[PDB]
Design a protein around this nucleic acid. Structure first.
Length: 105
DNA sequence: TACAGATCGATTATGCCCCAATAACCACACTCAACCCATGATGTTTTTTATAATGGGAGCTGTCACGGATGCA
């Protein structure tokens, strides 16, 4: 029944709304409701799978680390993030080129 | 009145970008020897002594008894 339960829709409104109130946006409840309608029309009937495993959260977790990376602070960014240096080496090199084009398009 | 189908809607398959680790390959470095060259303290060797000095035995060894040469007288 859950696989055919119209319960998720309402779950989308508050998840939207609690963010809008966090972003100090006016009329967050009504704003979230019409957004939920917008999701329903596009996503209606489509087999639509979204990335799991904090996929956007890491890519953002990636960004601010590169902001804190000073070329010497490898170890403290290791402790603060629990990520091991090997991957940090790779992500920092990637973010290097990423922000390289950011600073120099 | 009895018997059929028909679309909404769910589990299953198959493949790959990423990617969170995987391992080799290359880069620069401090600490600890190793040997040498002094300074000097310790070691080793050589030289000289001007009253006069002028021959030991150093402890013997304490004792058997055959044979075969052996060098003489």
């Amino acid at each position: 029944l859950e696989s055919r339960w119209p319960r998720s829709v309402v779950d989308l409104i508050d998840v939207l709304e609690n963010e809008l109130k966090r972003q100090n946006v006016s009329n967050p409840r009504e704003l979230a409701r019409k957004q939920a309608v917008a999701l329903s029309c596009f996503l209606g009937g489509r087999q639509f799978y979204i990335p799991c495993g904090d996929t956007i959260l890491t890519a953002l977790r990636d960004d601010l680390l590169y902001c804190q990376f000073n070329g010497r602070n490898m170890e403290e960014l290791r402790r603060q993030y629990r990520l091991s240096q090997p991957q940090i080496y790779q992500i920092i090199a990637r973010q290097r080129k990423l922000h390289t084009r950011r600073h120099q398009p």
